[PDB]
Design an enzyme around this catalytic site. Sequence first.
Site: not given
Ligand SMILES: CSC[C@H]1O[C@@H](n2cnc3c(N)ncnc32)[C@H](O)[C@@H]1O
Lengths: 292, 292, 292, 292
Positions: B31, B86, B106, B137-138, B155
């Site tokens: 992004q 954030e 994140d 990736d979470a 989040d």
């Molecule tokens: C606005 S999306 C909110 C947050 O999620 C994060 N994000 C998007 N997809 C994933 C994911 N699969 N795992 C972890 N964080 C993510 C983005 O970097 C952002 O900081």
Amino acid sequence: KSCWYEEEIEENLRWCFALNSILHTGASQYQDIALLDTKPFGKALVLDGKLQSAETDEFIYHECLVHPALLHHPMPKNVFIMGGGEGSTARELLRHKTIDKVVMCDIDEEVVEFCKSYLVVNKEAFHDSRLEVVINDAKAELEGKEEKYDVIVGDLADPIEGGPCYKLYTKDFYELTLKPKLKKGGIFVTQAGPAGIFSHTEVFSCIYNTLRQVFKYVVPYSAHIPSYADIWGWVLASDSPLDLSAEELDIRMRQRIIEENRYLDGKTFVSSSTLSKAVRNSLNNETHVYTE
Amino acid sequence: KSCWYEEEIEENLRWCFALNSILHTGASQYQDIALLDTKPFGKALVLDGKLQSAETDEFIYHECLVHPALLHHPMPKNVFIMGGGEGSTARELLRHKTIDKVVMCDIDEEVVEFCKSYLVVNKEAFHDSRLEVVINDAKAELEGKEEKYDVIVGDLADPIEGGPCYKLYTKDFYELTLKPKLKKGGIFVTQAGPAGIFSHTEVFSCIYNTLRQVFKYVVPYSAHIPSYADIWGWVLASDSPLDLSAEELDIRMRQRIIEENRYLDGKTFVSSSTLSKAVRNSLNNETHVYTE
Amino acid sequence: KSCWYEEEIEENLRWCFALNSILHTGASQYQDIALLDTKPFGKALVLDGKLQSAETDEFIYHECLVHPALLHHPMPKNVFIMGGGEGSTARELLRHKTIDKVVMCDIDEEVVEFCKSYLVVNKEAFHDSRLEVVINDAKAELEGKEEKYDVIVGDLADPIEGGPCYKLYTKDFYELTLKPKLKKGGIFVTQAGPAGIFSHTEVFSCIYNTLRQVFKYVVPYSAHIPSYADIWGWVLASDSPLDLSAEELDIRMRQRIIEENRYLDGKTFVSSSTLSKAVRNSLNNETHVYTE
Amino acid sequence: KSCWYEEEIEENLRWCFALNSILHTGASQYQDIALLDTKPFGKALVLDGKLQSAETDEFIYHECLVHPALLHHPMPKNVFIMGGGEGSTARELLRHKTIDKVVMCDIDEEVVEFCKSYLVVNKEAFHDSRLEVVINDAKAELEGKEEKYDVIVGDLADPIEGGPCYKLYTKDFYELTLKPKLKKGGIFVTQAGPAGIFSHTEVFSCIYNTLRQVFKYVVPYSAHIPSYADIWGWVLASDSPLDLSAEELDIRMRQRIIEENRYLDGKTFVSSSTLSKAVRNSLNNETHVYTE
Ligand SMILES: CSC[C@H]1O[C@@H](n2cnc3c(N)ncnc32)[C@H](O)[C@@H]1O
Ligand SMILES: CSC[C@H]1O[C@@H](n2cnc3c(N)ncnc32)[C@H](O)[C@@H]1O
Ligand SMILES: CSC[C@H]1O[C@@H](n2cnc3c(N)ncnc32)[C@H](O)[C@@H]1O
Ligand SMILES: CSC[C@H]1O[C@@H](n2cnc3c(N)ncnc32)[C@H](O)[C@@H]1O
């Protein structure tokens, strides 16, 4: 994507709706009148360049303004609206099977005539034999006639010092003009401006506090209106208690109101009347009282 | 006022904030990143041209997202944040005296470093020794580590079909990835999108119903966020009940949370979790389940 | 596409430029000062929220303001600018090989210091040993010193009754303050506001007419400036004739001005000074004279 | 002001007009049609979301397009308009006492009927017995009829590659279709796009140079159109010279044209046909020729 209606909600904050057309107009000495056909919110009545009622969501404002007050009353029969020329407050009142008479007292005949013709959601309301339209300043009308009412509904603009509607929010108005025209068990409700986390301090807390000086029981409540880009507020006031459960309110709605409400059930009202920490705190500590 | 940030927050609907300045920008594979200094809302983090967090009101979103889940746990110690680059989610979690470890996972390091550099309100949170930052990736991160958590916090972005976050809202994700990483008595909470009178049907009702297929006790709730011009939603989910009084919640905040919450007290949570008529009906009648 | 600078040019008419950034600011008691980095017009100096000079096209305004007056002079050596803190008028004057001395007299030291640092097109101009900067109201400076000049250049705001610059456009100013400070053969030139087909009546015709009451020869001229969304005007005034052919002007430019002009040749000036039917007609019939 | 029409007239540049109303709309196979009632410019015809003609200033475009060509002809009698469905080109042509026949050949009947119905200023022109309306592609129409004209007028859209009008600006079109339909002493004039200090390189210089490959005498000229926020261009072309004094032009207007022109007198045309330095240099150095 070329034509837009824009409003500065708060300064440095603009809310813009794509426009299909500018459908009809009037103007009176009291205010400019326009009906816009907007893409996100449908038809929108605008007075002095300020959105009043949008097709898609005005039911929220009119159901919240009207139904709590009537439902807390044991048998509301006659009712006076301060303002209401747009007609939707009347429409909502007239869904109550207990109601014999609604007096709509608006200062601006051009608003009434315009909305009667062009806000066709209210067509049947305007032709209900129970509705009496009076063209007059509401404070003058109330002072001048002896008739008392079960519910009085304020559907006016916010109180701004020096402005046309201020005098209908003062302690002296409520105490000397308004309460004498309520019957025993009577309930007042008024719109009370923005009720957002920051915006609630503008007039909502002052209205609540002013009512508190005059009526024994005062219940503030609020709900989001999408087209307003804020939470809006209303206040109930009465010398008899205002305390019904969600289920009691629901039973009353099913018995007394024609058709299903779209926004409001009993739980919705209980939630509306449970304000957030900071808003409760401002209302509790407010010392300003509107006087003139 | 001369300088504006404009965002089309819904088709045909523009929300514009007057600007003091454009502070910093950044970019990643995932992004574009910007920090604006706005007049109505202070410093505002924007990701791919979409407002995320504004200084004046992000407290509402972050107190709502975090505190209900921890307060309903008897003793929450370890917590895993999906997203949260954030830093305000972490900030709020770290206000709890029971917490000994916070994992912020994140996917985008640029977001983390951008906010760690430029979001002053979270400086202290990013340097807390309980906070561990993981760039992943979470979903992968949860699958690849056997550690289990008292609370997991979603989040992320809204589940949009074919989008990067969709897979972290599916029945299979919750059942096979997330649920096995909750300790006994574990609580999951996720942000759940817009929860407005009409906007609640986009994802909020589907997120509620999906969680209902997997957890015994699921509690949806909502609050207005001024800067979003909408109501926003969250959902609690657990295999133990999530049921405390306002008074219990308030005692627990006093016991466990450092300093006074700005938004949330016990009654505020009760109000938040009492949805309006149409929203409750959607949630209760919903049948869509998110699946791969 | 999210950040915009907007100006209401004429009311009910908005001109909007996409913004890269808000680069630098100041403010003085005299005016707000900003440098914007805009997409269509590059860097843009804005004073009191009004665009003054845009990177891409300010050469048009500064070449038109400066070169006709100097070129009509047989040997212009010393020159006084009323205003000119932005520095580009000076830059253009200093391209003349005949010039020994330029006095820049601006009331606002913050404008001078800001532009000296941040309008780097003018860096060499500001460091030219021929430039003397004076911080003062230009009318006070001219009245207070005896020195006479070959050319005096007005680069001030439009004359608005009650406003700060009005008094430097009056008949009495031109007759009693200004003409005594011109040498024999001296030429005055001033910017003279909008010169569009409708907009020319605001101040351009009055300035022309006012000058006509004092100086024997008065030559109005105009050119489009894209960033201004209008034609702009200037007026030459002198007690010696102002009548040179296009080729005579070209020969003088090649001999006397360092580098090629980008906007102006002799034919361009001849065209600029041939106003359209309606504009000529308003200038000829104008009776308003600025007095105080 | 609350209602705006917005047009992105160049990338990153928005031009917005306050609206009184949206009068009428229409559509065809070729384009969407709208008539707006604007505050700054009166009634404005918009085609595919692009401003065409505004009531307050369309006189400028139409006097510029028409009168120079006819005035330079010894006795212009018959004239063919390529496009001109809007009707103002016809209106201006019909002001000439020498004219006995005007063919308006527009491809889109919906445009013709829309304007004939709703553009009041052209009502009389549409009903003039000298005016003949033909609904066709002007290229096909010219090829399919052997009739020849004293003047041909191009009132089309700009030649954009792969666009519907491109083919009416090519060398081959001019040489093999248009030139054989000019009577001896015939004059062609075409609108030629933006003619601003930078915008002149889009099509104006290429249209000039293309006509130069085919006609012995080619005269480019330009004028500011407030509602377009740019200078606009036209080009005259003929195998006889196009050279009259301002005084000759003025005598001829007096002899031939009913009532006073609002924009154009002889000196105005001289000024119009004296381009600025950079524009003349582009036109004179140009090498692109439009070909299939
Ligand atoms: C606005 S999306 C909110 C947050 O999620 C994060 N994000 C998007 N997809 C994933 C994911 N699969 N795992 C972890 N964080 C993510 C983005 O970097 C952002 O900081
Ligand atoms: C925007 S105000 C809402 C309505 O209240 C009406 N109104 C304003 N002032 C008064 C008044 N003093 N008495 C009755 N109606 C009023 C207006 O005509 C409008 O319809
Ligand atoms: C927008 S005005 C253009 C310039 O004129 C300057 N200015 C305004 N009034 C005066 C004055 N009376 N004398 C000299 N400069 C002035 C301002 O500081 C600015 O740089
Ligand atoms: C805005 S384009 C100007 C006019 O040209 C018309 N037009 C476009 N292409 C052609 C063509 N090939 N022949 C005739 N008229 C045309 C359109 O209908 C419009 O009214």
